[PDB]
Each structure stands twice: as structure tokens, then as C-alpha cells.
Write a protein that binds this DNA or RNA. Structure first.
Ligand SMILES: [Mg+2]
Ligand SMILES: [Mg+2]
Ligand SMILES: [Mg+2]
Ligand SMILES: [Mg+2]
Ligand SMILES: [Mg+2]
Ligand SMILES: [Mg+2]
Ligand SMILES: [Mg+2]
Ligand SMILES: [Mg+2]
Ligand SMILES: [Mg+2]
Ligand SMILES: [Mg+2]
Ligand SMILES: [Mg+2]
Lengths: 106, 194, 199, 188, 171, 130
RNA sequence: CAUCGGUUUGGAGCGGCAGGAUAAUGGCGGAGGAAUGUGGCACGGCUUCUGCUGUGUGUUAUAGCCUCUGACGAUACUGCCA
RNA sequence: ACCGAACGUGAAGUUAAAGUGCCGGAAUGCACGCUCAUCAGACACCACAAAAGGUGUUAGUUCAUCUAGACAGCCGGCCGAAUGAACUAGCCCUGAAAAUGGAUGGCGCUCA
RNA sequence: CGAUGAUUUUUGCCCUGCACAUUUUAGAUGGAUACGAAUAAGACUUUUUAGUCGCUGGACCAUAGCAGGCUGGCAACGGUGCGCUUAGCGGAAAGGCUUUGUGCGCUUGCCGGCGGAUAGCAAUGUCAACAUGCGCGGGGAUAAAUCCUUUGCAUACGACUUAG
């Protein structure tokens, strides 16, 4: 009862980019404990939440969310590409996201 | 093109920047290296430059053309009334250098050294070191505790001493307070001496 | 692969640039890293070779004003810090925050002397260098180029290792007593079931 | 070429006990004990019996194989240092100025004091290494005997004494003065 | 490369003068049959007045190893070009397949002589039946009786970036 | 005596049992080079492999001639009963326990926690009185 | 969320068919042979012959291996599956 | 000005040339070797280095001596098994000296 | 970057126990889980002969209960949280690590009884540590610096050394 987590910990690592040009429409996400594309393919299609705090209350809450989804793997070390409704702000590079266990296929 | 002729540089690059000293009291950058086997003794003293004079002296320098012959020499007089010991500081060796751990003061400080801590002494209530003087109330166990801390942890012990500037002809009433490192003996020996 | 609150790396026996690159990517990705015992780090190549390299580094200074030029830090932690900062975009705000996520020390000062230090196998000298190659200890290179506090660190490291050995002897004794109690409570119904479950 | 395996065999005389643990050799004999660290070399040791020890290099290249017989020779020198000792004899060579060599003791330390070398007013002092004994030979005129269990220490004191007496600013083919090692043998 | 051994057979195009020209076979070590037929014409025009335009490829067949799980020693006779001249050499390789010995040879002359694939002619690959046929010591040292050797200083590959225990190299 | 500390390495020799892919057993039948060996086993394919791709186990199949064919290797493996010797070691037991743990379900993990609670109760009770 | 259509990236995917030296191997059988010669035998150095071991001999014995081959049976690889 | 590719405003997929330790998206990937530099080296155009040398190390070529005991060492013996010469070319080193401090782009890298 | 002196008789300041409300966050969401050293080596047992361990943390600890409610019993006399309390160690940046007794809870070690619905088939569905302010309560203390005049060890002016 000390733990209540139903999501996998993730991190916003980068945008999709070449050496000099970045593409904000695709985010690179590191899912915790995933080290290969085979592991990362479990999470394809899963929802992602970026939860953050804001100055103004909206309906009595100062907590806002940007929703996204895992679309494909990236590279060979288990990072995935994510697609959020609104692009994650660049300040969130290194910020933690939540990888939801739904849509479930277990 | 090169210089037509060579000449040495004017002045020393080892005394830069040629700026004003941060304080008028010269500070001992380095103290003599400590030898434990020697007796406990001070390594510095504060005085006041009075003036210059002339002496006559018989030279003892074999092989010199002035050997056993009178020489006339300039000399400097430094007025040095006795200094008063009022405190002790313990220093600890750290991977970042010496660090002062604790400063223990005497119960009574004279007015000339308590004026050191004031810019406007005449307008003050002269409250300096009054609560600290109260720390010596009938057992001085706070003082003994700090002294034990210095004995236990300090590697370099320096005393706090001030000049008795009222014994000089100077009109200044602020004493000059300085740290003088104690060399010789163990750390406990140094703390007991202070 | 877990996200840790702080990763404390024991820097002994680690190759400088390989540890630097791994730590750089860690702090860029939002991980707080502390590196202790930077005086025990290693650089491949003989000591004389690395000392010559550091003197090449010392040669470089702003001609018109030496106070503007590169600032050659002599401490082992600062040598590691220079290696990392060269691998970080330190002139951006993001790189500055990433560098705020990092701490480097000589020795193991508090509070890290009573915490867990890990190693990084991809940067370990004993696992990376061919067993005959020559290497340098950054503590000796630092002393050879101006670092003043080698003997203070080793005096404090010997004191720390004596205290940590008293710790370990106590922990081993309580581990022996707990193991004897688990042996006593073995072959019980719960133990047999946990053995059928793999525990 | 990466030679698959190379071996050398130490031979241990009857009264000598070699003792190896983590490339730290401790040789014990009638004459004392000697120790040597070999942690800078990758070699392995096998005790064949009480009289033989195998020293092995596995999959070693040319230089790493070369470092094997030197390990053998160093341990053998330790063995003969603790069972026979080492003795280097030095002869005093001078054309005009006699070399005045004394065994002095200053500050609790032994020194070899060379005076009048080529007439110089300078006094040369050589520290005597621990475990090394100096003696002015009685049976021979102008001879110094350097003896001890460690061959390295004995030869290095002898070399120090020889090197401190070098001639400067002269034709050293003509000015042959100095103190030279004439005999390298054993005490027994 | 990753190679196969091919039997390539070819001939001059028949003429009314010569209606059955002689059939010539070559053993070619090539990654595929396109390079096998290219190398065939490359060596035939070094050895005969023939071209691909005036010739004909008759057969291309893979030659599989006879005993792919029998350890052998091969001697390979080579003709390679250096930066300065042309040299003949003979080298030896240990392997279970003839193709894998030729692959090792190509890596070895790339490493020791900077000789590229284009600069090498394989004159001959022969399996050395007798232990006395082995001339080179770097392969003769593996033909000794009761050969044993350890593998000191084992480096274990980790899946994680950080390890909580001290590294070891026993094995 | 001399008292020389000797290495306890595992040797590359004919008869060494090795793990392949951390799953299957095999034995060395002939040495190719410093880097390559020929391995064979009842449940593996006879192949030339690199020693980096395998792990030497502390087990030797005794009296295996160099270059033995598959029939000989299988017969001697069955005679020496290498499978039981492997399965009796702590290494194989740890591999088996890892597999068994990986096959647990959520309900079984819950039961594991409950049984661990019971055993911890008993263990603390024994420790406090001894 | 479901189902569809268009585009597309995948799975430790599963099955069927074909080709090749109608794979080469391997396993089984037969014939021949050798050595980095197993047992045995004859000499030895250390072993209460305690994986004892070294050197000679010779050819399966108390291990085996190589070559050729006979009838089967697979697999790899490359293609095809509307 | 070279390589790739030529351009309306977008979404998804895949590539070219170039890359994948960090700066930087992508492997501290799999593999066979070579090299240790008290000025290593590091990628076309292109931003340099030669002749000549080295018992550094590697691999080759051709001669010659070899169990009818080769070379070395103690006086034919003695352990026993390889040895000598010339030559070829890989990497490394010498050759290799310029003026503000400084550039394989930087950090740094040595079974890379 | 450290040590140390003094810190406003103002309703201002310091320390402290709560209660409430706020702003910020380079980014809590069970636990940063403490020998040292070698690596051609370590650690067990006998014997220094030999056997055994590792071959990754896919570990260890913790983990059940309206984000965890209300009650009952059994077995043990243990485990754990909080509050006083005893003693010791730790100065590298110690600010933490142990420890005595006591009290109040809980205990999922085992067995019970009652409650959760409707938030509607998901919407972070809001649960943390740091800080500040504000109300109370309890303790505690009761300054200086600058301008100005002066000095001349100083000085273009600032600044500096003095004195008042
Ligand atoms: Mg000039
Ligand atoms: Mg001269
Ligand atoms: Mg002259
Ligand atoms: Mg569809
Ligand atoms: Mg067949
Ligand atoms: Mg072109
Ligand atoms: Mg990257
Ligand atoms: Mg040349
Ligand atoms: Mg050469
Ligand atoms: Mg050069
Ligand atoms: Mg570049």
C-alpha cells in the first residue's frame, strides 16, 4: 500500500533531429527498464502523459497533462518515438513522463 | 621586426597588479614550518616603525677589507611594546585547505582592542563581547568545551594578540589585532600555552 | 537501467574520457550523478606522456592578458570536470542545468561516505585496457602539476576506511546471525512453498 | 605471434624456501630473507615440488615473453643472495692524488667518504643502502668491498660510488682516475 | 568478404572452324555468382585470347566443403600487389572450411599488408594432410599433443550502465 | 615448504563442457586456434565456434579423444552422465531458479509475498531469542 | 472503443512446395589407412605404480581418428505460395 | 564551384552522400589482425611532407647450416633443436626548424 | 568559502509547537540498499594438497487492508510508527550513525464480522519536499553603519588610515 503506481516511468530525451535541425513533432522517450527494440515493442501504441504544474487553477486544479502515444521504436537501445497532441516543450528534455499500461493487449 | 638592440624589461612581473593593498596591516602570508620538538613559542610580533638611525660597528668578516674595522650603518627602530594575548583559533586540514574551526576568546578584553570592532565607538553602546564575557560564568564549561574541540581537531593553532597602542605616541586608539601562529609542541601544548 | 534519485559513482579505476562520456549522457538525460574518489581515476598512457599533455594544456593562455585565458585546474575532480564539460553544450541553459546535476570530489566526503557507490563497467580500466598497457593515476598527475592536497586526502581516506571497516565487521556479524536464524526457520511449511515458487 | 605458452623452471636448493603469493616473491635462506614485488608483470607460478617452480606466460607476445626469463633471473638472484651473498670489489685508480676512502657515520647514517679525488677539496659522500655492508680491504691496498644479500642493492651502491668519481673537463682516456668495480662475485 | 567457392566453366564461342572449343574451369572465391563470372573472365583474359563478348559461360556451381566439421590446416599460395611491386607469398590458416580459410586470408592480408581484395590473386588453396606439411609456426603450435591453455582476464559484458559490485576477471 | 599460490583457471582442452547461448551444454572436441574451437553435444549441432561466444564450465568429460565424432561424443557424454553433473551445480540451479521465477503469475507473486511475511515472522522470532 | 478502407513499419512468428552434388555433412553398414599411437608390451624419474609420467614398438585392443563407398533419413541456403 | 540531391503548402514511410563514445539523431555493435609515438593516428577535393635509415614489431622471398647433434656458452664433450645471411613491405620511430595560445571541429580516445 | 563579536524598548527582532492560506519547482510518485583491495586474482572448508562460490541488480529489503475505513478473536512477548528519555561515536562539507528505558498506537503471523456501488466503459482525476506569508501559544535578547566634522600613515574623485 506504500506503492500505487500503475504506469512505467519514462523520460523525455530529445526531439527527432539530425545534427543541426530538430523536429518537434516527434519526441524521443526513454522507457525505464527497456534496453532493446524487442522490449520497446511491448509499449507501441500505449498512451503517454506529461504531467506538470501551472500557476493558474483550472477547475480547482493546478495540474495539467499533455497526452501522447508511443508510435515506433528508435535506434537499437530501446528508445521509442512518441507523438503528443501538443509538442512537448523543449524545456522538458530530461523531464519524467508516465507510460500508461493502456490500451492493454495482455 | 625584432628590436634593434636588446634590453631587459622594466620592472618585475612578479609584483602585479600594482594596486593598493587591501588592508594597511600587512598580513603574514606564510608562517614558519612547525617543528614539534621545539618549545612552544610565538612566530611573529607587531610593532610600529619609529624612524631610522645610524650605528658604528666592528665588522667580523674574515677575508673582507673591512674586517675588524669600523663600519657606519643605517638602522631602523621599531617601537614594540608588549602585545596582549586575547584569543586562540584552531585550524583543520581539509582537501580544500586550512579551515578555522573555532575561536576562543579571553574573558576580559581591553578597551583598545574592543575599539577595533567599531567604526563609530563614541556613538556606540559598546556591547562587544559582553554576552561572550558572560559565557565565563562561574564554570566556563563552554570555553573548556571549545578549547577541547581545538585540542581534538586542530592541526594549526594561532593565538590572537593585539598591540598596546596606547603605549606608543600615536594618536590612534584602535589596537592592531593579528593572528600569530604558535609553533612547537603538540596541539594540546599549544592550546594550554594560549 | 532504473531511474535513480542520485547515482554515486566510485571513481577509482575508471578511465577518464569513457566515464566522462557516460556521465555526460546521464546528466543530459536528467540523472543526478556524484563522482567520488577522483584522485583514483585513470588515464591510459604512461605518466610522463600525460604530464606532457597537461603541460601542452598549460602552454595555452591569453597573450594580451593571462587572467582571461584558459583556467588550468589542477585538482583531479576538476580534471574530470573539464573532460565532462567538454562533452556538454555548456554554453546553453540546458547544458548549464545538466552541469548543475553533477558533483565531483576527491576522497569520499560526507554525506557520501555512508551511501552506496557503484561502478561503470564500460569505463573500468581493468575491463577496458589490454592487460599490458600503461596508465596514469590522476592523483599523481595532479600532484605533478600543482595540486596541493594529496596527503590530506590520503590521511582522511585512511581514517574513512578504518571507520568503514568497523561498519562492515558489524554488518557481517549481523548477517551471520540472520543467516543462522533463516537456517533455523528453514524446512518449514512457508519455506517449502517458497522453494516451490523459486524463493 | 602470440606464443601459446612459455615456461621457465626455477631450481630451489635444499635450504631455500621460495614463497609466492599474488606475484610477491619471498625467498628465505640461511643468510636471511629477501622480498620482491612483480605486480608489473603478468606471470603465473606453479610449485612442481619443493625443489622446482614453473613460471608461465600464456598467450604472450614477443615482449611479454621477453619479460619471463628476467623474472626467472631476478628470483634466482634472490635465491643466491640468501644462500651465498653478493660481493663487489672496487679498486681505487689514481695517477697522482691518492683517493682517501673512509666509512663514516653522520646523523646515524652510514656514508662512504671520498677525499682527495684528483686533488679536489670537495668531499664526496655516498649513502650506504640498507642491508649493504662496506669494508676497506686489509689484504689489498686501495680496495673497497661492498657486500650484501641483495644483488641489486650491492651493485647500485657500487655504481653510486663509481659514478660520483667521474672526471670533468679532461681527456678521460688520459685521466683514468676513479673507483671501479673490479670483481663481481659471491660472499661464499 | 563473405564468400562461396564456385566452379565456373566457360569456353570460346564455337566457330565454323572450331565447333567444339576447349572447356576451361576455374575455382573462384566470390560472394555471389555475378562476381564469380566476373572473376572468371578476369582470369581468362589474363591467360587466353578470349573475352566475355567472344566467350560463353557454360556452368556455375557451388562447391561445398567435404567435411565442414573436420578441423584442417590450409596452405594458401598468393600473388598480391603492394604499393611498390608484385610479390608471391605462401601462408597457412586453421579452419574447418576452405572458404573460411580464404576469408581469413583476405582479412589477414588487409591487416598485415594493406592489400585489398583487388590486389590479391589466390594461386592455390591446399589442405595439408600431413603434420609435416605445416611450415608456419603460428599454426604449427596448435598441432602439439594434449594442447591446453587458459583464457586469463575474462571481461564480462554488462547489460546495465551501473554495477553495484566490484568487477572480476576470473575464468 | 615453498607454498606457491597457483591459478585456478579453466582450461581450453578436449572434454571441457561449455554453455552455448546460456542455455545448452556442449563439449570441446578439438582446438582450432587461440580463439576458435569445435564443439559437439547430444542436444547441440557440431560446429566451429569462437571461445568468446561460449562459457567454459568447471566440468571435463574425461578421456575424450581429440576430434571425436558425434557418435563417440554422445556415447561418452551419456556414460559420464554430464547432464546430471551440470544440473547438480549451483550455477545450473541458479539458472533454473531464474527461469522458474520468470514463470510466476501475479497471483503466485502475491502468494510469494504472503509466505515471505510468514517466514519473516518466524525468522525474527528465532533471531530475537538467539 | 469497435469495425472498415488507403498507406506503411514490424513478429525469437507458424505451415506447405521446389531446386542444388535430387545440397555437402551427420547417424548406420562395408573396405582400406595412418599418427599428435589407445590398450598392451620393453626400458626409466618420481610416485605405499594415487587422472603417475617419459621414450620406443606397432594399427584397436581396456580410446579413437582419417579416406573411399552403400542404402536410407534430415538440415542449411536460395526461391515460390492468388 | 566537392559529394548527395535541385525547391509550391502539408502528413506518414524510406533513403542518398555522410555517419552512430559525448558535444549530435544513430552501436562504447559483431569480427579478424596491426600499432604504443618523452612531436601517435584519425577519412576524397583539403588544407602537406621526401630521399635515406631502425636486432621496434609483423608478415613474406630466396639462399645456407642443421639429430652423420645447427647457432650461443664451459672446457670433441656438455643440455638439445632449431640457426645464419641477403632481400621485400605493413604499422611505428629517426630524418622533422618560426615566430600571440590553439586546434583529427572540440572533449577525449590506446585488445580505441 | 570558514570562524567569531554585536545585532534596534521597537511593538520592531530571534528561537520554538501548531493551524490556515499561498508562490516557485531543469521535474518525488516503495528504498541513493555504505568495507577495502586485487584482477596472471578474491572468498569459504579441511588442509595449504585439494574441493566449493561467481558466469551479473531478472538482486536485496520493503510490498495485502476506504491513498488503505470500523470492530472481534487466536498464537507470540516478537516486528514496526510516533513521543519523551539514556549513553556513545562522527569535523572532509561533521548536521548524521548507533544506543538505554518508557508510553501510546498498529501488526498481514493466523482466523472472523461490517463498509466501498452511481466517479456511470478512460479523462494526472489532484495525496510529496522545499519556501514564504498570516493567525495563535510558549520562551528570549534590547544594535550598528553611513552622511557630517577631524586626520594625513592616504588620496584626481570615490576610496583609505585616524579621532569625535
Ligand atoms: Mg633580438
Ligand atoms: Mg665536455
Ligand atoms: Mg682541456
Ligand atoms: Mg487497416
Ligand atoms: Mg553421407
Ligand atoms: Mg561523381
Ligand atoms: Mg546519441
Ligand atoms: Mg623508407
Ligand atoms: Mg620494417
Ligand atoms: Mg612522423
Ligand atoms: Mg569531424
Amino acid at each position: 500500500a506504500e506503492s500505487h503506481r500503475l504506469y512505467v516511468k519514462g523520460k523525455h530525451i530529445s526531439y527527432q533531429r539530425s545534427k543541426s535541425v530538430t523536429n518537434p513533432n516527434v519526441s524521443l522517450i526513454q522507457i525505464e527498464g527497456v534496453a532493446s527494440p524487442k522490449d520497446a515493442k511491448f509499449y507501441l501504441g500505449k498512451r503517454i502523459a506529461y504531467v506538470y504544474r501551472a500557476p493558474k487553477e483550472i477547475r480547482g486544479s493546478k495540474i495539467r497533462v499533455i497526452w501522447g502515444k508511443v508510435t515506433r521504436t528508435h535506434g537499437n537501445n530501446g528508445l521509442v518515438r512518441a507523438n503528443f497532441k501538443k509538442n512537448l516543450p523543449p524545456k522538458t528534455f530530461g523531464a519524467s513522463v508516465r507510460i500508461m499500461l493502456y490500451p492493454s493487449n495482455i | 621586426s625584432h628590436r634593434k638592440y636588446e634590453a631587459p624589461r622594466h620592472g618585475s612581473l612578479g609584483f602585479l597588479p600594482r594596486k593598493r593593498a587591501a588592508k594597511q596591516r600587512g598580513r603574514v602570508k606564510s608562517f614558519p614550518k612547525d617543528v614539534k620538538s621545539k618549545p612552544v613559542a610565538l612566530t611573529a610580533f607587531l610593532g610600529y616603525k619609529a624612524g631610522m638611525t645610524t650605528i658604528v660597528r666592528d665588522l667580523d668578516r674574515p677575508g673582507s677589507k673591512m674586517h675588524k674595522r669600523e663600519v657606519v650603518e643605517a638602522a631602523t627602530v621599531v617601537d614594540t611594546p608588549p602585545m596582549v594575548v586575547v584569543g586562540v583559533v584552531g585550524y583543520v586540514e581539509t582537501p580544500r585547505g586550512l579551515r578555522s574551526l573555532t575561536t576562543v576568546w579571553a574573558e576580559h578584553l581591553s578597551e583598545e582592542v574592543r575599539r577595533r570592532f567599531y567604526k563609530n565607538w563614541y556613538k556606540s553602546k559598546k556591547k562587544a563581547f559582553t554576552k561572550y564575557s558572560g559565557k565565563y560564568a562561574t564554570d566556563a564549561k563552554q570555553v573548556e568545551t571549545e578549547l577541547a574541540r581545538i585540542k581534538k581537531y586542530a592541526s594549526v593553532v594561532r593565538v590572537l594578540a593585539h598591540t598596546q597602542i596606547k603605549k606608543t605616541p600615536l594618536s590612534q586608539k584602535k589596537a592592531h589585532l593579528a593572528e600569530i601562529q604558535i609553533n612547537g609542541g603538540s596541539v594540546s601544548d599549544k592550546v594550554d600555552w594560549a | 537501467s532504473s531511474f535513480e534519485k542520485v547515482v554515486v559513482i566510485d571513481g577509482k579505476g575508471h578511465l577518464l574520457g569513457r566515464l566522462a562520456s557516460i556521465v555526460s549522457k546521464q546528466i543530459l538525460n536528467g540523472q543526478k550523478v556524484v563522482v567520488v574518489r577522483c584522485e583514483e581515476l585513470n588515464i591510459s598512457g604512461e605518466f610522463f606522456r600525460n604530464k606532457l599533455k597537461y603541460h601542452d594544456y598549460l602552454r595555452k593562455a591569453t597573450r594580451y592578458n593571462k587572467k582571461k585565458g584558459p583556467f588550468h585546474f589542477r585538482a583531479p575532480s576538476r580534471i574530470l570536470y573539464k573532460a565532462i564539460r567538454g562533452m556538454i553544450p555548456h554554453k546553453t541553459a540546458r547544458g548549464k542545468a545538466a552541469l548543475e546535476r553533477l558533483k565531483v570530489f576527491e576522497g569520499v566526503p560526507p554525506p557520501y561516505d555512508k551511501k552506496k557507490r557503484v561502478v561503470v563497467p564500460q569505463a573500468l580500466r581493468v575491463l577496458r585496457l589490454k592487460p599490458g598497457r600503461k596508465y596514469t593515476t590522476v592523483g599523481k598527475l595532479s600532484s605533478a602539476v600543482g595540486w596541493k592536497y594529496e596527503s590530506v586526502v590520503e590521511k582522511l581516506e585512511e581514517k574513512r576506511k578504518v571507520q568503514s571497516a568497523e561498519y562492515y565487521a558489524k554488518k557481517k556479524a549481523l548477517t551471520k546471525k540472520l543467516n543462522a536464524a533463516k537456517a533455523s526457520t528453514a524446512e518449514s511449511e512457508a519455506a517449502q512453498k517458497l522453494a516451490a515458487f523459486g524463493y | 605471434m602470440k606464443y601459446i605458452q612459455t615456461d621457465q623452471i626455477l631450481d630451489i636448493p635444499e635450504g631455500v624456501t621460495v614463497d609466492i603469493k599474488a606475484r610477491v616473491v619471498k625467498v628465505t635462506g640461511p643468510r636471511g630473507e629477501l622480498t620482491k614485488d612483480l605486480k608489473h608483470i603478468d606471470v603465473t607460478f606453479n610449485k612442481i615440488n619443493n625443489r622446482a617452480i614453473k613460471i608461465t606466460v600464456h598467450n604472450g607476445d614477443r615482449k611479454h615473453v621477453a619479460a619471463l626469463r628476467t623474472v626467472k633471473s631476478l628470483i634466482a638472484n634472490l635465491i643466491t643472495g640468501v644462500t651465498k651473498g653478493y660481493k663487489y670489489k672496487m679498486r681505487f685508480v689514481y695517477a697522482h692524488f691518492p683517493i682517501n676512502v673512509n666509512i663514516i657515520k653522520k646523523d646515524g647514517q652510514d656514508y662512504v667518504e671520498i677525499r682527495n679525488f684528483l686533488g679536489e677539496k670537495r668531499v664526496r659522500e655516498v649513502k650506504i643502502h640498507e642491508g649493504v655492508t662496506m669494508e676497506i680491504s686489509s689484504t689489498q691496498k686501495d680496495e673497497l668491498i661492498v657486500s650484501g644479500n641483495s644483488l641489486e642493492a650491492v651493485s647500485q651502491n657500487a655504481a653510486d660510488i663509481q659514478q660520483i668519481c667521474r672526471v670533468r673537463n679532461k681527456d678521460i682516456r688520459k685521466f683514468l682516475d676513479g673507483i671501479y668495480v673490479s670483481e663481481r662475485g659471491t660472499i661464499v | 568478404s563473405r564468400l562461396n567457392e564456385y566452379q565456373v566453366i566457360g569456353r570460346n564461342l564455337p566457330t565454323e572452324s572450331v565447333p567444339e572449343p576447349k572447356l576451361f574451369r576455374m575455382r573462384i572465391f566470390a560472394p555471389n555468382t555475378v562476381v564469380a563470372k566476373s572473376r572468371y573472365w578476369y582470369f581468362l583474359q589474363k591467360l587466353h585470347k578470349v573475352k566475355k563478348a567472344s566467350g560463353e559461360i557454360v556452368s556455375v556451381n557451388i562447391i561445398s566443403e567435404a567435411k565442414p566439421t573436420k578441423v584442417k590446416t590450409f596452405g594458401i599460395w598468393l600473388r598480391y600487389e603492394s604499393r611498390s611491386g608484385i610479390h608471391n607469398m605462401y601462408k597457412e590458416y586453421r579452419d574447418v572450411t576452405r572458404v573460411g580459410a580464404v576469408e581469413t586470408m583476405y582479412q589477414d592480408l588487409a591487416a598485415r599488408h594493406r592489400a585489398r581484395f583487388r590486389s590479391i590473386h589466390i594461386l592455390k588453396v591446399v589442405e595439408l594432410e600431413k603434420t609435416d606439411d605445416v611450415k608456419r609456426q603460428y599454426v604449427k603450435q596448435f598441432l602439439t599433443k594434449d594442447l591446453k591453455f587458459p583464457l586469463p582476464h575474462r571481461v564480462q559484458k554488462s547489460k546495465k550502465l551501473f554495477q553495484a559490485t566490484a568487477p572480476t576477471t576470473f575464468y | 615448504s615453498s607454498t606457491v599460490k597457483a591459478a585456478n583457471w579453466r582450461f581450453v582442452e578436449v572434454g571441457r563442457v561449455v554453455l552455448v547461448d546460456n542455455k545448452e551444454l556442449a563439449t570441446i572436441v578439438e582446438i582450432i586456434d587461440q580463439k576458435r574451437v569445435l564443439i559437439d553435444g547430444p542436444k547441440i549441432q557440431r560446429q566451429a565456434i569462437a571461445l568468446a561466444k561460449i562459457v567454459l564450465t568447471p566440468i571435463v568429460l574425461p578421456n575424450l579423444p581429440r576430434g571425436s565424432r558425434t557418435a563417440t561424443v554422445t556415447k561418452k557424454w551419456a556414460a559420464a552422465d554430464i547432464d546430471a553433473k551440470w544440473a547438480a551445480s549451483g550455477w545450473a540451479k541458479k539458472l533454473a531458479n531464474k527461469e522458474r521465477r520468470s514463470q510466476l503469475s501475479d497471483f503466485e507473486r502475491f502468494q510469494v509475498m504472503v509466505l515471505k511475511k510468514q517466514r519473516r515472522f518466524a525468522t525474527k522470532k528465532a533471531l530475537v531469542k538467539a
